[PDB]
Amino acid sequence: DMYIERAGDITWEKDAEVTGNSPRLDVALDESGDFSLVE
Amino acid sequence: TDGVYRVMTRGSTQVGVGVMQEGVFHTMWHVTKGAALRSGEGRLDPYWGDVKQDLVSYCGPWKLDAAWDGLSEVQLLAVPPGERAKNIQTLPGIFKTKDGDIGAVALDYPAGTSGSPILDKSGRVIGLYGNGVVISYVSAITQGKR
Ligand SMILES: CNC[C@@H]1CCCN1C(=O)c1oc(C)cc1C
């Protein structure tokens, strides 16, 4: 079955790399928890 | 004990990640499907869960309540399988929905990273990573209700 192992503190890091875009997307959320794009 | 944790299943594989805060373990529903979790010789049982939000809490109610401020960079505290926890800073995009806007991060990590927390500049968990869409994967910043 399933088990947990600690991996770190919940902390902001001053030395953090910045990456990734910031897209603005229209989406719908269905009953199964799935997001889908809308146009 | 407070912190970010790997969710393992048994060879052993990492199926996800979660957050221990205020005595409650928080992860995404699709990671565990609500299964009980071993923590030492103890067992953690689900207390609240919601498939539509894709969230589940163990041992008590959902405790995480901070939200993205809509303007500031955030950090994904990513815990990928087999890799040390690492912080990835990013400016969220936005999922625009009929029920309001949700922050989203355009970061693509292995599936076993699902449940990793997204943090604001004060170190508060503003949501979990791993439920999203493809346009390249974009994750909602999924936050529950306290
Ligand atoms: C250890 N067995 C847990 C069982 C079976 C898997 C789901 N579940 C639950 O107790 C539960 O399910 C929802 C949707 C909320 C809660 C509290």
For ligand 1, pick from B25, B39, B45 the residue to mutate: most ligand atoms within 8 Å of CB: B45
Among B21, B68, B90, the strongest candidate for a mutation testing the A interface, having the largest count of A CBs within 10 A, is B90
Determine the distance in angstroms separating the CA of A34 from the nearest CA of chain B, rounded to an integer.
7
Q: Resolution in A, one decimal?
A: 1.4
Q: State which approach was used to obtain the coordinates.
A: X-ray
Q: Is the distance from CB of B17 to CB of B5 less than 8 angstroms?
A: yes
**CATH (residue range B74-140):** 2.40.10.10
Sequence-separated (6 or more) residues with CB below 8 Å from residue B129? B76, B78, B105, B107, B109, B113, B114, B115, B116, B117, B118, B139, B141, B142
Placement of tokens 């087999």 in the chain = B82
**Range B1-15 burial, b when 16+ CB lie within 10 A, else e:** eebbbbbbbeeeebb
d(Cα B99, Cα B96) in Å, to the nearest integer?
Answer: 8
Q: Which of B123, B51, B21 is nearest to A6 (CA)?
A: B21
Return the CA Rg of chain A. Answer: 17
d(CA A27, CA B133): 9
- Taking phi over 0 as left and psi of -120 to 50 as alpha, with beta for the rest, B98 belongs to alpha
**Run of H or E including B13:** strand B13-21
Give the Å distance between the CA of B50 and the centre of ligand 1: 10
Question: What DSSP designation does A37 have?
Answer: E
Residue of B24, B30, B47 with the most ligand 1 atoms within 8 Å of its CB, for mutation: B47
Task: Compute the distance between CA of residue B77 and CA of residue B122 in angstroms, rounded to an integer.
Answer: 13
DSSP 8-state secondary structure symbol assigned to residue A16: P
CATH ID of B3-58, from 1.20.1740.10, 3.90.190.20, 3.30.70.1380, 2.40.10.120: 2.40.10.120
Q: Which two tokens stand for residue B62?
A: 């959902």
In the numeric block, which tokens belong to residue B53?
Answer: 């939000």
Rounded Cα–Cα distance for residues B119 and B37 (Å): 24
Residue B12 annotated in active site: no
User: Which parts of B22-61 are beta strand (E)?
Assistant: 24-27, 37-39, 42-44, 46-50, 55-58
Rounded to a whole number, what is the distance in Å from the CA of B34 to chain A's nearest CA?
11
